[PDB]
């Protein structure tokens, strides 16, 4: 199912911009043509109506994405070998700050090459690559150079594959629609075999090298990874069970492998991370489970399941026919699959962000506060963006590919017939949550201002205790020995076990208390999430029609309005709902990251002394100061911003410059959001007049930006400015202290 040489390789189409569209290829009468060229670059569905060609175009771009990712990985690995102090950091991870970037001295920018330890001058990095390299057994820079070379080779291979599968042998449509085979392969081979290979690498390389490192041996005296394979005596000395070979595995005497395959739980006191034996056992079990899961769906040999057969058998007295017809929708529309995958990926990213901080998987990662904060905020933002994109593409599918005549589905029909109740109930829930979550903050502020601290919602006057979460913490703290007999310690130290882990005089992790403030902040999170969901679902559900504009589907997915009639019809399209929900996503993620930062700085992170007294960074003021808006403004925003505003003249002045630059970018966006196109089109007419006077009027007539373009520019600049401000503030605050 491939075609030989579908499209000739030529430079002819390079010299004719806009060849993908008939209208754009005509020529640039005005300046709107240039903007329209870029906005429709990757909309393959608008270029042609053939599903096979769209699938072939989609298949090739992923190869370019993979090549770009491989180039990025190659650069990251190469910079750590040539412009880094990784070897010096390896001998003292607790007193040296990782750095992998140096700057050329031209205009006085060499001040950014601050001292970081190990006789090195550079920029301190917070991506956590040093911990990953240490956990993999990497010791010298030659291995990093080899990894960079391999990544370059893989990027070249990906680029060649991308060219080949589009210009020499393009698969047919019947190849793409083999969902059962694709699922079987991506489950058994992509995931299970990868987990098995990583488990093997961890067993044979990471474990002995990491044990030698934790023993305190000089990294230059540790035997090379290949010495543990050729010389089984070394492994037998390290692990006696290796002397028996693979015989216990094939005789089901798996108890002999308990030395390097454990079920301990908790953190390693030496490094502050999870035990590597637990990780190896976890990867082995996950590989087995994924290998089993990949033999469910039917193929050329009869045995297995048919996804259509599974779907068609589920229906209920409330839902009618049920899931019949969903198989044909998901195997014919690219947008629905994209929306579902984007939503699932965003949720998974948020879950990963939440899980990484409380269960540190890398050595010397819990005590690196900047890395933890950066990873948390980065992954949360990525998850939010993916979640928004899911709804955007769901609306796109609803507008374009919906067709009840040939693709009828009962479940989709029933949802669209009672959307008013869903929207009204969601509106009521949002209003109730906003009143009963944010209103308690204003009450506390008013009572504090009036001089009545005894009438506030606080731990000392009127308690609002999160009794349900405390019960979960108590249950999980008592899990070992009762409901998890095979475990020695709890999964996390934050459950409330009472034990504290200190590495290098710093607090890695300890139980986290929950009080009245956590109740309020959690309900604030719920309120913001509910409002965002309301906006996106209202946008998706009313994409085709409404009581105001019955024929909204004919106007398309991205149109500005339908005139000033009916009192005003501004921003009625589904695109405008995504444009509006991006702001609320930004708001929710900012509140969440502020909560995380303040809570960790106030109740977890700190230093321990010889007598064992913990002194936190901010002194534990979160409980009594976060219950008012004035407290958030004073003890968090005003107090913690002194690091970034006093960074001039030092190696951290770049963050100080980025603070003001992001301020300017954020403030600059309000011009596009608060104004309209007619004023700017009328203003241009006067500017064109004087150019005509001096014979400098261009033939490409200048036109003001369209309404949609202006809204997009405004939202983009707004988001960029806000995120850059928060990034600069966080990094400047956390690197110094």
């Amino acid at each position: 199912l491939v075609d030989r040489d579908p499209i000739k390789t030529s430079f002819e189409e390079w010299a004719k911009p806009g060849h993908f569209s008939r209208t754009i290829a005509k020529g640039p009468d005005t300046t709107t043509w240039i903007w329209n060229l870029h906005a429709d670059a990757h909309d393959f569905d608008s270029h042609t109506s053939d599903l096979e060609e769209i699938s072939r175009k989609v298949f090739s771009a992923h190869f370019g994405q993979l090549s770009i990712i491989f180039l990025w990985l190659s650069g990251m690995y190469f910079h750590g070998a040539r412009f880094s102090n990784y070897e010096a950091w390896l001998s003292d991870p607790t007193h040296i700050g990782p750095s992998a970037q140096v700057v050329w001295p031209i205009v006085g920018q060499e001040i950014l090459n601050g001292d970081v330890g190990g006789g090195f001058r550079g920029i301190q990095i917070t991506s956590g690559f040093f911990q990953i390299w240490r956990a993999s057994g990497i010791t010298s820079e030659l291995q990093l150079y080899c990894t960079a070379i391999g990544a370059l080779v893989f990027a070249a291979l990906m680029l060649f594959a991308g060219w080949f599968h589009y210009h020499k042998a393009a698969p047919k449509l019947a190849w793409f629609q083999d969902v059962e085979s694709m699922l079987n392969h991506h489950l058994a081979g992509l995931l299970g075999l990868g987990s098995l290979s990583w488990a093997g690498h961890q067993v044979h390389v990471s474990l002995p090298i990491n044990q030698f490192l934790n023993a305190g041996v000089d990294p230059k005296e540790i035997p090379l990874p290949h010495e543990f394979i050729l010389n089984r005596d070394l492994l037998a000395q390290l692990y006696p069970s290796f002397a028996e070979g693979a015989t216990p595995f094939f005789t089901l005497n798996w108890s002999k492998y308990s030395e390097f395959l454990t079920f301990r739980g908790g953190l390693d006191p030496v490094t502050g991370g999870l035990w590597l034996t637990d990780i190896a056992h976890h990867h082995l079990a996950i590989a087995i489970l994924f290998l089993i899961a990949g033999h469910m769906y039917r193929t050329n040999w009869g045995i297995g399941h048919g996804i259509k057969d599974i779907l068609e058998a589920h229906k209920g007295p409330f839902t009618g026919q049920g899931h019949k017809g969903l198989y044909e929708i998901l195997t014919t529309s690219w947008h629905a699959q994209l929306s579902l995958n984007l939503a699932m990926l965003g949720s998974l990213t948020i879950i990963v962000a939440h899980h990484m901080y409380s269960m540190p998987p890398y050595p010397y990662l819990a005590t690196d506060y900047a890395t933890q904060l950066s990873l948390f905020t980065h992954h949360m933002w990525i998850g939010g963006f993916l979640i928004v994109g899911a709804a955007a593409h769901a609306a796109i599918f609803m507008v374009r590919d919906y067709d009840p005549t040939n693709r009828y589905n009962d479940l989709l029909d029933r949802v669209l017939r009672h959307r008013d109740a869903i929207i009204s109930h969601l509106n009521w829930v949002c209003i109730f949550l906003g009143f009963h979550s944010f209103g308690l903050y204003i009450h506390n502020d008013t009572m504090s201002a009036l001089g009545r601290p005894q009438d506030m919602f606080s731990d000392t006057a009127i308690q609002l205790q999160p009794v349900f979460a405390q019960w979960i913490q108590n249950t999980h703290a008592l899990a070992p020995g009762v409901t998890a007999p095979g475990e020695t310690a709890s999964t996390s130290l934050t459950w409330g076990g009472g034990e504290l882990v200190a590495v290098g005089g710093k607090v890695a992790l300890l139980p986290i208390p929950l009080g009245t403030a956590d109740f309020l902040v959690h309900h604030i999170h719920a309120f913001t999430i509910h409002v965002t969901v309301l906006i996106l679902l209202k946008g998706v559900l009313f994409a085709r029609s409404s009581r105001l504009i019955p024929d909204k589907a004919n106007l398309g997915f991205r149109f500005p309005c339908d005139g000033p009639g009916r009192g005003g019809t501004c921003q009625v399209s589904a695109w405008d709902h995504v444009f509006l929900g991006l702001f609320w996503m930004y708001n929710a993620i900012s509140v969440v990251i502020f909560h995380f930062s303040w809570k960790m700085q106030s109740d977890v992170w700190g230093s321990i002394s010889d007598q064992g007294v913990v002194t936190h960074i901010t002194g534990g003021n979160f409980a009594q100061s976060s219950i008012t808006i004035n407290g958030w403004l004073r003890d968090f925003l005003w107090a913690q911003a002194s690091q970034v505003i006093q960074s001039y003249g030092s190696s951290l002045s770049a963050y100080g410059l980025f603070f003001l630059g992001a301020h300017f970018v954020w403030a600059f966006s309000l011009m596009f959001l608060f104004s309209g196109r007619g004023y700017w089109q009328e203003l241009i007419e006067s500017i064109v007049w004087a150019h005509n006077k001096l014979k400098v009027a261009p033939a490409t007539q200048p036109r003001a930006l369209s309404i949609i373009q202006g809204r997009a520019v405004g939202v983009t600049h707004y988001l960029l400015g806000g995120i850059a401000t928060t990034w600069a503030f966080f990094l400047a605050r956390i690197i110094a202290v």
């Binding site: 007295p317 409330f318 009618g320 017939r417 009672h418 008013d420 009438d455």
Partner: protein, 160 residues
């Protein structure tokens, strides 16, 4: 196949749906017996019942959450605040009745049942009926507040 959700009264072009939440026999019986749905009874008695029920309710939050909740004057202040709220609600009802209904006009309530049987329209949707309802509501609210205060702080009942 058996189906649960049905169009309202068999007409699929009216903007409503029949669901177990709306058309269950228990819920249908419960709602028809509320004083606000007894269209064949004097509005004064229904207003008195509604006022009593709502006035008994309003004492508790004012008493337990008020600024004087931790003093000896908690009950009296809570009862006085509840009475003030009842007075405000009575004023609102009177204003709504004056603004909405005009003297001499017939009732605007529907005169058809769900099964198509004809019935007399409710008299609550007239000026006189609404005035009677508001007066009964005021009287019942004051009486209920007084009863709640008497029970709570004149008889030493082992509450809580």
């Amino acid at each position: 196949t058996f189906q649960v959700v049905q169009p309202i009264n068999g007409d699929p072009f009216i903007g409503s749906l029949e669901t177990p939440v709306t058309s269950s026999p228990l819920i249908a019986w419960y709602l028809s017996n509320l004083p606000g749905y007894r269209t064949a009874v004097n509005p004064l008695l229904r207003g008195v019942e509604v006022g009593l029920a709502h006035g008994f309710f309003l004492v508790g939050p004012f008493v337990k959450a008020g600024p004087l909740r931790n003093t000896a004057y908690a009950g009296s202040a809570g009862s006085l605040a509840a009475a003030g709220l009842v007075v405000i609600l009575s004023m609102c009802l009177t204003i709504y009745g004056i603004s909405s209904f005009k003297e001499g006009e017939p009732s605007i309530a529907p005169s058809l049942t769900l099964t198509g049987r004809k019935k007399q329209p409710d008299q609550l949707q007239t000026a006189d009926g609404w005035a009677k309802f508001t007066g009964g509501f005021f009287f019942g609210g004051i009486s209920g507040v007084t009863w709640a205060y008497f029970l709570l702080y004149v008889l030493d009942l082992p509450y809580f």
